[PDB]
Amino acid sequence: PKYKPSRLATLPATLDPAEYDISPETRKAQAERLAIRSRLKREYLLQYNDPNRLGVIEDPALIRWTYARSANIYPNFRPTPKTSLLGALFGIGPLFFWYYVFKTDRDKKEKLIQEGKLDQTFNISY
């Protein structure tokens, strides 16, 4: 048998065909990725091993992440049909659904109260 990857169960590198590509362009790309990683690591180590430095080493990636998660949300937002539809169906949809459910339950209880069918023998605290 074989392993079928999913969104919550990714395909391991051992079973990943791309891992076994030994073409020159892929090797150069891996070298470039390592170069970027090494540069960033070197900068962080230089700041981190500096005896004079007494403080938090600011991480630009973290700042960008926090900004994009909150600050940049609206500026990039466009009123697309998808966004409008999803926003409506998850904003007012649940509200209307819960309203319907609760209203029906309340009206049923009130009907039982009106005809006296509802039992309230010791329901003296409300």
Binding site: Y3, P5, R7, L8, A9, T10, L11, P12, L15, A29, E32, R33, I36, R37, L40, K41, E43, Y44, Y48, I57, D59, P60, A61, L62, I63, R64, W65, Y67, A68, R69, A71, N72, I73, Y74, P75, N76, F77, R78, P79, T80, K82, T83
Partner: protein, 91 residues
């Protein structure tokens, strides 16, 4: 200021500048699809949990298994080791 996430890259020049900003290769860099959801030019990093990352590699942040300056996943908080795990399973 220019080191802050911007709008969806339209020209290839914008894409290259965004790739440089996030310290990613231009080839690797991929913005989220311009669906109007406010993602912007933030990189669409692979949706893999931090647990999948090599536990033997020396990370700048060991508990989070991350390096300083490395682009951070949009849903990192969801993909922390303490939360949803996308690691491969035997079956």
């Amino acid at each position: 200021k220019d080191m802050f996430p911007g709008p969806y890259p339209k020209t290839p020049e914008e894409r290259a500048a965004a790739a440089k900003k996030y310290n990613m290769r231009v080839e690797d860099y991929e913005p989220y699809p311009d669906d109007g959801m406010g993602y912007g030019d933030y990189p669409k990093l692979p949706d893999r949990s931090q647990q999948e990352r090599d536990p033997w590699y020396d990370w700048d942040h060991p508990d989070l298994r991350l390096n300083w300056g490395e682009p951070i996943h949009w849903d990192l908080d969801m993909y922390i080791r303490n939360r949803v795990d996308t690691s491969p399973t035997p079956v």
